[PDB]
Amino acid sequence: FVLPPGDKVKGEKLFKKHCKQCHSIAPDNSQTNSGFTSWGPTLFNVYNRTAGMSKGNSPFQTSPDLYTSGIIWNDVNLLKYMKNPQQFVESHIGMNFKGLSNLQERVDIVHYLKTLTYDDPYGKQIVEKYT
Amino acid sequence: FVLPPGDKVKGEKLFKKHCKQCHSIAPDNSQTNSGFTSWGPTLFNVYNRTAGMSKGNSPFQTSPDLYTSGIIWNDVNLLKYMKNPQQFVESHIGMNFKGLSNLQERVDIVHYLKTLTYDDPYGKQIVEKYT
Ligand code: HEC
């Protein structure tokens, strides 16, 4: 497959219409993950960039010998992701988050999350483990 | 509304089964923007934290005069977002990306993104401006 003929001016227009609300184009590189100006990461230099979702189900979490170069934002993957982001995530990493319907489970999760703070004993324990 | 009674141990187990795949619990503070250890941001100290999606649809024509991130991850918002993230996004920021059906528009977008690079003439101008 080769990237078919397209119009980059039309592309700028479509980007301002559909993507600019959540994505910057600034060449920060310090914004390539989430960033500080836009919600989503800067899409500058995104072409052939290693995708952030490569870190989902990180093999590094259990061992540094399981390094993974990850998924690349080449032409095909950009086209497919722009077609259907959720199906792309599910098909490339194995699953996505569509929400938890049960209310007690979500409440229990909130109770757990409230302990992940710099003041809670459990949170203080998580802190020293990473210091 | 008050947070109903909950079990933080069951919450930890639910977090490990449903959230740890894409979320760290590391006190990085710099990882709150997805960081690098995980695809999603660290959920450590996420309670009552300003949500990253507050940065979407930013009035950058009056950026110095009108900007005050104000989606807070309090109990209610966490429960709502965990129930249906996409509906939460759509109802709190106004819209969400569900994909572009047409193939030529996506191709044109890829053509525009290929010019966002440190060596393309257009990408060079974007660099010049934002420094
Ligand atoms: C909010 C309403 C968004 C709109 C509209 C678009 N995107 Fe987005 N995208 C958004 C976020 C918060 C994130 C980060 C979390 C995630 O799911 O990855 C993204 C991610 C991307 C990426 C991945 C970048 C990476 O470094 O891995 C790309 C390439 C991307 N988004 C492109 C993109 C395009 C082409 C859009 C319009 C056609 C678009 N996004 C809209 C939030 C939002």
Ligand code: HEC
């Ligand atoms: C990947 C498959 C994920 C799973 C499973 C869960 N989350 Fe996540 N979440 C993910 C990303 C890539 C992002 C950043 C982009 C975005 O849409 O915001 C998030 C974001 C959050 C946030 C916002 C944090 C902030 O700083 O604003 C929260 C509070 C959050 N996610 C919570 C959460 C919970 C409770 C989960 C399991 C029950 C969970 N997420 C799963 C990706 C993924």
